[PDB]
Amino acid sequence: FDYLHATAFQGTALARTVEGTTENIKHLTRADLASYIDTHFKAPRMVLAAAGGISHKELVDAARQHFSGVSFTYKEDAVPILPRCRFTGSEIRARDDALPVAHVALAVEGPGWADPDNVVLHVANAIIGRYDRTFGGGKHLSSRLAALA
Amino acid sequence: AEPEHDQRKRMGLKMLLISALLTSLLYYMKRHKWSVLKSRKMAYRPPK
Ligand SMILES: CCCCCCCCO[C@@H]1O[C@H](CO)[C@@H](O)[C@H](O)[C@H]1O
């Protein structure tokens, strides 16, 4: 999946792995980490979520209490919109015949959270579904691709 | 000796134009398909 991203969005931010590079891990600084937290972990970009037997009012109260720091400027309350990532029809083939089985991942560009089409797409995926050798349904599964498989 | 003389040349003319047009288009098509290989890049990444 990292390779899928690395090529689908080559030359952009989405092309990077979450764990980062070997070089970065070897040289990141106490500074950089601090800088990351300061730059990114900010109130307008965060959400306190709770589920279970808790009182909203009780919850919001505690928040105000330990989630202090208020902002002065207008830049501190601005949620930055990221530079769009360009999709590219391409391929990356990492070959090693010494590996037991092959992995293949193919994909087209999706719409993004907001779009209502995402609902349909998920319904679509529901038709093709998924499968693995321990599905008891076997040759009777409703998924045509699972059946042939 | 050759009554077809004129028709033969009128055809030769059409043959040339179509020939030029087609050879061109097919050249693009060929290049377009091969582009995948012509620009392809590769690397050797041993576990070295
Ligand atoms: C590379 C393939 C080229 C094919 C070119 C086809 C053109 C031939 O076209 C011919 O022209 C003659 C003269 O007008 C006509 O009399 C014939 O009926 C017509 O078939």
Q: How many CB atoms lie within 10 A of CB A7?
A: 16
3-state SS track over A99-127:
CCCCCCCCCCCCCCCCCCHHHHHHHHHHH
- So what's the architecture of B4-48 in CATH? Up-down Bundle (1.20)
With a CB cutoff of 8 Å and minimum separation 6, the contacts of A1 are: A105
Per the CB < 8 A criterion, the answer to whether A90 and A7 are in contact is yes
Distance B26 CA to ligand 1 centre (A): 20
Resolution in angstroms comes to 2.7
Distance B29 CA to ligand 1 centre (A): 24
Distance B5 CA to ligand 1 centre (A): 14
Per the CB < 8 A criterion, the answer to whether A143 and A131 are in contact is yes
Q: How many CB atoms lie within 10 A of CB B3?
A: 7
Structure tokens at A39: 């730059």
Structure tokens at A2: 């990292």
Phi-psi bin for A143: left (phi > 0), alpha (psi -120 to 50), beta?
beta
Pocket of ligand 1 (CB under 6 A): B 7, 10-11, 14-15, 18-19
Structure tokens at A114: 């907001």
Helix (H, G, I), strand (E, B) or coil at A143: coil
Residue among A43, A31, A49 nearest A71 (CA): A43
Nearest protein Cα to ligand 1, atom 4: B15
User: Ligand 1 pocket test: which of B5, B11, B15, B17 has the largest number of ligand atoms within 8 Å of its C-beta?
Assistant: B11
Nearest protein Cα to ligand 1, atom 16: B7
Distance A138 CA to ligand 1 centre (A): 61
Nearest protein Cα to ligand 1, atom 3: B15
With a CB cutoff of 8 Å and minimum separation 6, the contacts of A45 are: A79
Q: Which residue has the tokens 């930055």?
A: A80
